[PDB]
Design an enzyme around this catalytic site. Structure first.
Site, PDB file in Angstrom:
ATOM      1  N   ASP A 186       2.704   2.558   9.481  1.00 39.18           N
ATOM      2  CA  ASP A 186       1.462   1.840   9.062  1.00 39.18           C
ATOM      3  C   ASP A 186       0.258   2.754   9.239  1.00 39.18           C
ATOM      4  OD1 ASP A 186       3.002  -0.268   7.853  1.00 39.18           O
ATOM      5  OD2 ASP A 186       1.836  -1.853   9.135  1.00 39.18           O
ATOM      6  N   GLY A 207       1.410  -4.634  -1.665  1.00 41.55           N
ATOM      7  CA  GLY A 207       2.438  -4.670  -2.505  1.00 41.55           C
ATOM      8  C   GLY A 207       3.431  -5.899  -1.831  1.00 41.55           C
ATOM      9  N   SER A 208       4.762  -5.996  -2.449  1.00 38.25           N
ATOM     10  CA  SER A 208       5.707  -6.762  -1.915  1.00 38.25           C
ATOM     11  C   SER A 208       6.860  -6.225  -1.409  1.00 38.25           C
ATOM     12  CB  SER A 208       6.254  -7.739  -3.234  1.00 38.25           C
ATOM     13  OG  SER A 208       4.910  -7.828  -4.211  1.00 38.25           O
ATOM     14  N   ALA A 243      -1.850  -7.545   0.056  1.00 40.78           N
ATOM     15  CA  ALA A 243      -2.655  -6.887  -1.067  1.00 40.78           C
ATOM     16  C   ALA A 243      -2.272  -5.748  -1.647  1.00 40.78           C
ATOM     17  CB  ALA A 243      -4.106  -6.644  -0.352  1.00 40.78           C
ATOM     18  N   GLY A 249       8.276 -10.622   2.831  1.00 43.94           N
ATOM     19  CA  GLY A 249       6.807 -10.277   2.832  1.00 43.94           C
ATOM     20  C   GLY A 249       6.110  -9.882   1.539  1.00 43.94           C
ATOM     21  N   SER A 250       4.886  -9.987   1.696  1.00 46.06           N
ATOM     22  CA  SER A 250       3.638  -9.593   0.686  1.00 46.06           C
ATOM     23  C   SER A 250       2.402  -9.537   1.115  1.00 46.06           C
ATOM     24  CB  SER A 250       3.635 -10.383  -0.680  1.00 46.06           C
ATOM     25  OG  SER A 250       3.877 -11.701  -0.302  1.00 46.06           O
TER      26      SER A 250
HETATM   27 MG    MG Z   1       1.012  -2.993  10.373  1.00 44.45          MG
END
Ligand code: MG
Ligand code: AYS
Ligand code: CL
Ligand code: CL
Ligand code: CL
Ligand code: CL
Ligand code: CL
Length: 348
Positions: A164, A32-33, A30, A27-28
């Site tokens: 997160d 990072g990748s 805003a 995934g990626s």
């Molecule tokens: Mg999250």
């Protein structure tokens, strides 16, 4: 210094130590990748995140430093930790790219609330783990700010990690309309009436616990005002004592325009739930943030009697966040970040 190798996957250059093999895009955003990889040093499957444009502005450079400091500090069974951080740069002068390495996560709590039949014992164990992790995070004067089911990783043994953290990333557009990004927020922050404090995370745990008990979102508002009306119908309207604590004249005039409503009977809302679960929900979902139960108080509630161990609920080392009030140039934030990359010591 390890040996690095370079490759292009999905339009992006990845330069990483030989220890990380079989990289595959996952995934990626805003920020990072991300690639999944096999770490030959530890034997774990890992997530490797390459930051995008880490030093493009003062705001971006400070956000990069903030994230690296927070991940380096967090050492707890129920919180994401940092396995590795690296840069291919050989000096400060050629430093541009930052890569972060964590354990690769599978299912989140969204998966298990949608698809699985949960016993009361599952709800006890899952909320116990969130509160154990939050006792640790709040003891360092850290606020998560974004607890929701997609930010909680769960395995086949019902073991849970918080991830997160809110790095003050979310925008106005992201919080607008029928969106899960707003459903777990306390009503005094979503309408920008109170400065953030650690009590806001306990409101979010209340919303998560309600959804594990019913299988449905507690406050799925179509916009900020719809969501406030759902909240006040359940917990009632602000009492005069809470009105006194609001600073904004325009906030008080609006609240005062609504018809008064009493707090509802939670046993008639959460029909058939464990009476001790209903009692704990009434202690989390309190409008006045000064009166909400804390994480440390919640761990000792009788709902968790089969899991509570006061000798195995640790607190954090002290966390210095004085940098947050500091005014620096891009290259000064970049030098601070470089020092934190080169001083990193991996876990056992
Ligand atoms: Mg999250
Ligand atoms: N102490 C608080 O909790 C508080 C302080 C300052 C401003 C707002 C606040 N809480 C609040 C007010 C009104 C409503 Cl409806 C819901 C929560
Ligand atoms: Cl290596
Ligand atoms: Cl971890
Ligand atoms: Cl670099
Ligand atoms: Cl979510
Ligand atoms: Cl510190």
């Amino acid at each position: 210094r390890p040996t690095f190798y370079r490759q292009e996957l999905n339009k992006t250059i990845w330069e990483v130590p030989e220890r990380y093999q079989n990289l595959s895009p996952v995934g990626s955003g805003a920020y990072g990748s991300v690639c999944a990889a096999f770490d030959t040093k530890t034997g774990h499957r890992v997530a490797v995140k390459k930051l995008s444009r880490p030093f493009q502005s003062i705001i971006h450079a400070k956000r990069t430093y903030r994230e690296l400091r927070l991940l380096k500090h967090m050492k707890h069974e129920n919180v994401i930790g940092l396995l590795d951080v690296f840069t291919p740069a050989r000096s400060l002068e050629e430093f541009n790219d930052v890569y972060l390495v964590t354990h690769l996560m599978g299912a989140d709590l969204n998966n298990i609330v949608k698809c699985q039949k949960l016993t009361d014992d599952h709800v006890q164990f899952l909320i116990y783990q969130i509160l154990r992790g939050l006792k640790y995070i709040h003891s360092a004067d850290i606020i998560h700010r974004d607890l929701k089911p997609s930010n909680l990783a769960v395995n086949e043994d019902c073991e849970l990690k918080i991830l997160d953290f809110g790095l003050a990333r979310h925008t106005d557009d992201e919080m607008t309309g029928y969106v899960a990004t707003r459903w777990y927020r306390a009503p005094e922050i979503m309408l920008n009436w109170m400065h953030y404090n650690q009590t806001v995370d306990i409101w979010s745990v209340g919303c998560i616990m309600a959804e594990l008990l019913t299988g449905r979102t507690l406050f799925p508002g179509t916009d900020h005002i719809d969501q406030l009306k759902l909240i006040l119908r359940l917990v009632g309207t602000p009492g005069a004592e809470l009105l006194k604590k609001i600073s904004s004249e325009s906030a008080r005039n609006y609240i005062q325009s609504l018809a008064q409503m009493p707090k509802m009977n939670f046993a008639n809302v959460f029909i058939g739930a464990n009476p001790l679960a209903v009692d704990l929900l009434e202690k989390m979902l309190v409008l006045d943030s000064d009166k909400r139960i804390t994480a440390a108080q919640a761990l000792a509630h009788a709902y968790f009697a089969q899991y509570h161990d006061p000798d195995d609920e640790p607190v954090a080392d002290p966390y210095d966040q004085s940098f947050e009030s500091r005014d620096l140039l891009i290259d000064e934030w970049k030098s601070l970040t470089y020092d934190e990359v080169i001083s990193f010591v991996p876990p056992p």
